[PDB]
A paper describes a structure:
Like other flaviviruses, the tick-borne encephalitis virus (TBEV) envelope protein (E) is composed of three structural domains. Mouse monoclonal antibodies against EDIII, an Ig-like domain that mediates host cell attachment, are potent neutralizers of TBEV. To gain insights into the mechanism of neutralization by human anti-TBEV antibodies, we solved crystal structures of the antigen-binding fragment (Fab) from the broad and potent antibody T025 (IGVH3–30/IGVK3–15) in complex with the EDIII domains of all three subtypes of TBEV. The broad and potent anti-TBEV antibody T025 recognizes a lateral ridge epitope on EDIII that is also targeted by antibodies raised against other flaviviruses.
Crystal structures of T025 Fab in complex with TBEVFE EDIII and TBEVSi EDIII were similar to the T025-TBEVWE EDIII structure (root-mean-square deviations [RMSDs] = 0.54 Å for 518 Cα atoms and 0.26 Å for 525 Cα atoms, respectively), consistent with 100% sequence conservation between these three strains of virus in the EDIII epitope residues. 59 antibodies (46 from convalescent and 13 from vaccinated donors) were cloned, recombinantly expressed, and tested in ELISA for binding to EDIII proteins corresponding to all three TBEV subtypes: Western European (TBEVWE), Far Eastern (TBEVFE), and Siberian (TBEVSi). All but 1 of the 59 antibodies bound to all three EDIIIs with similar half-maximal effective concentrations (EC50) ranging from 0.2 to 12 ng/ml.
Residue numbers in the entry:
A (entry chain H): 1 to 52, 52A, 53 to 82, 82A, 82B, 82C, 83 to 100, 100A, ...
B (entry chain L): 1 to 212
C (entry chain C): 303 to 396
Write the structure that this text describes.
Amino acid sequence: QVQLVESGGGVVQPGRSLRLSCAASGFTFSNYGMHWVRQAPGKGLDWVAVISYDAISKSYADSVEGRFTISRDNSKNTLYLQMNSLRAEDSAVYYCAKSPTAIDPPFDYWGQGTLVTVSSASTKGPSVFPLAPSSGGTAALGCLVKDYFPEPVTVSWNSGALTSGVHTFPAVLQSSGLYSLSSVVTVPSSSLGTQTYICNVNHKPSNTKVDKRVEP
Amino acid sequence: EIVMTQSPATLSVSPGERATLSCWASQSVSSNLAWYQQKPGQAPRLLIYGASTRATGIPARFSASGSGTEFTLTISSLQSEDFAVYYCQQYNNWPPRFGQGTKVEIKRTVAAPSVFIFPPSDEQLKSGTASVVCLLNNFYPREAKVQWKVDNALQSGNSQESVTEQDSKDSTYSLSSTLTLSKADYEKHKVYACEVTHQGLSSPVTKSFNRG
Amino acid sequence: TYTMCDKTKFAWKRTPTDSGHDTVVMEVTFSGTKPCRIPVRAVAHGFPDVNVAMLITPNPTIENNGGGFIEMQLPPGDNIIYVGELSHQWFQKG
C-alpha cells in the first residue's frame, strides 16, 4: 500500500533555510517521478517542483526558482526539498506527491503534508480560558485557546467521549502574530448541574497539554 | 504561462442532485487535464486524468469530459462524501498549473443561528486582557454579519471571526467572533452586546450582558 | 534547459527506415507534458550498456507544437533502437 510521509516542517525565520524530506514505501520508488505541491492556509494547490524517476530531470515553479532545490535518494526511498532564502509567502503545507509515470503529472498519491511557518514569532503554548455556560433547553459552553504559536492545536471534550454538538473553530492570526481559537459544545441545560465538561487542549510544538474544567 | 480558471467559485446543490463544475484553460491543453478532490483537513485525491478517465477506486457517479480549453466534471447523485473542494490541473505544458478550486456545498433550507455571548473569564481578566466571545450556532446559509456594541457604540477593528466547515449531519455552519479589549477598557464600560444579521432572522438579534 | 520527455508516452508515427543517404530515420508522437528532450539511444544486441546511436538530429525535442523527427547512424550488425520505452530491432548493413 503506497505511503508517503513528509517531515522537516516547523517554524523558520525569514531569510533562513529548511530541508523537507518525504519517505516513500509500498512501491518501487525509483520507477516514478515525484513532485512537491504546497498549500497556504485557506488557499489553493500550488505546484512547486518535479524530479524525474532517475533524478536527471528537474523543474521548478517560477516563485521558487533559484531558491529551492529538489533531489532524491533512490537507495533510501526518500525525496528532498532544500528551501533557501525563505519568505513569509512560502508558509504552507508542503505535500509530497507521486507521478504514475516517469516524470509527468497527474499526482496519483499524496502524503499528508508537513507545515512550514516562516515567521519571527517564538513558539508559545496557549492560555486556555473557560467559556462558561449561563443564561431554550440547551446550554453552550466552551474553551478559548489564546495566544499560541505555531499552528496547530487540537481540542477534545472529555478525552474524546464528548463529540456530539462540538464545534472547534479555525484559529485566527492576531496582530501579535500569535493564533487564537475557540471550541464550544451545546449540551442539555439539565446536564449542567450533573455532567462534568473538560476541554483537552494539546499544542505539540510547545509540548503543552492543558485540561480546563468548564463550570457554571 | 497557462492560466487555469474554475467556475463557479461555490456550487450549492442538494443530496442526490447533479453538480457540474467547469475548468477553463487560457490555451489548449489537449486532453492532459486532471481533477482532484480535497476534503477539509485531508490531502487531495486524484479523481480524473486524461480529461475523462476515472482513477482507481473512484465511483461511477464521477464523470468528466472536455478537451482543448474547456473541461467539465459532473457529479451525478451527490452523496455526503462528495461535498468538498475540487481542483483541476493542466499537465500538457510545464509548469503544470492548478485551477483555484470550486467548493461544492450542501444546499438546505434557511436556518437562523442560535446566538450566545460569553464574558471574559476572571482568569483571563487577572491577566490584563479581556476577550468577549459571540457564538452563532447552526445556521444556513453561510453569510452572516456580527456587529459588536459596547455601551451601544458600534465597534470596529477589535474583533476577529472564524467559521466552521459545513456540518455533516444538518448541513449548517457555526461562527465564533471574539472582541478583544484591554482590561482597563473592559472596566470602563457596562453593556457588551453581539448583534447578528442573517437571512433566517426577520430582524437583527442582539445578545448582551452587563459587566459584573 | 528542458527536462527529458516522460519515457512512457511515445508511439511510433514512422518506424525506423532507411533514409536513402545512409542514415536511419523515424518519427514519434508524444502524449505527455511539453516541451521536453527526447530520450533516444540504441544498443548492439546483447551489449545493453554501450550506446551506439550517433545522432544526426543532436538534441531532438518535443516542442509545444512540433518535434518528433529523429535521424541517426548505427554501427553494422544487429541493433535495438529506443525512444523512451519504445524499442525496435534493427539490422544495419555493412
